[PDB]
Symmetry: C5
Subunit: 103 residues, 5 copies
């Protein structure tokens, strides 16, 4: 398995690493039907989503989508610095695939 988020990200098509080294500036979450998702922003304006679960996802990803929204919420409320995000860049906002947190 990959040793880090950069190596993990490179295993997939349509991805890119974003290097933030900053806390989350805003956290949004919705329960509206067909938009059950989260959206975060950083102070520079860069915006990211956790996608609504769909036909593009395999079953194993469902629990991990729920965990990512948990992660983002707590990271936001603790002001944790996000180091990098691995995202799919074939969506807007870019869709989070993975996150790294470091000091």
């Amino acid at each position: 398995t990959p040793q880090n988020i950069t190596d993990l990200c490179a295993e997939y098509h349509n991805t890119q690493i974003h290097t933030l080294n900053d806390k989350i500036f805003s956290y949004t979450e919705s329960l509206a039907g067909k938009r059950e998702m989260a959206i975060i922003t950083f102070k520079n304006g860069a915006t990211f989503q956790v996608e609504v679960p769909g036909s593009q996802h395999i079953d194993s990803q469902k629990k991990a989508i729920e965990r990512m929204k948990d992660t983002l919420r707590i990271a936001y409320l603790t002001e944790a610095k996000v180091e990098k995000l691995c995202v799919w860049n074939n969506k807007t906002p870019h869709a989070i695939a993975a996150i790294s947190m470091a000091n």
Copy 2:
């Protein structure tokens, strides 16, 4: 997908944005039958609910309703500033559809 809570709220009928930019003043939750819900207030007297799950909800919303009560609870306890709420204004108290936190 929407970039922010205002654009997401605009996708639905019978909704509005409330701009609070304030922490939650009170948090209430109930396990009583047919009243399994949360209610929050702001110091200006605005009151909102997370509805009881029912027939107006699609299955994918169920997990999201539970997550939203989770979110409000921790927002309350951490005194996190709520920026905006997207609500259905066809219910009393207005029913939460999405939340944004910033600052």
Copy 3:
């Protein structure tokens, strides 16, 4: 729907509001069979339970019972002030139906 805990509490028989306006003094939780419950006390000696799930509860209350014990544990640990409890008083200790937190 109800706008506050007092109006909610009044929808049910065999309930009363207790006004605490205090943090929880003790939190006790059990996994022993037939006693899978939580008990909280306040420094005025008032004691309350989250009842073991049973045939008195409808299906939709199950998730909310588990949520209540999460709420009471985190309230305890954060020393959050509990404003009011809505309880069933046909049980000893009185059984929690709803909680409000403020101040």
Copy 4:
């Protein structure tokens, strides 16, 4: 029905109360097969387990076992004072049945 941990503990055979009145010294958890358990210790050297779910546990204890591991984790991290533990003493380490937390 019990109003406190001592009374609840007394309801079961092969149990005893340990009075700690201290925070947890160490918290251990495992995901290894057939050892999906938690172990806590105190600075006096007392060691306790949350048992692996098995055929001694009825269905309704399974959820409560999960919650107890949650509770011990967060108690540990917050340095909350543990007042008493109700344990089964026919297992080594003694097996937790209930916990009370108080200042």
Copy 5:
């Protein structure tokens, strides 16, 4: 049952104990398909994973895998010192079987 992480770790083949006595330096988690995992590192560079659930895990480990990612995230955020890790060393990064935390 085991009294500590060292005795638990010794019940399994292909395991070793790593003694860290330090907080986690970075936390990574992924929802990408077939890489639904967590990776942590320590300041000395040492890197560990929580494996993707697979056919080498029995059903009872599934829930504990979920729990371990929860634990590592909150450990990371609270800067909790990790005492020891029990890992399987037949994988790269070494795969976490158990964790102990102590100050």
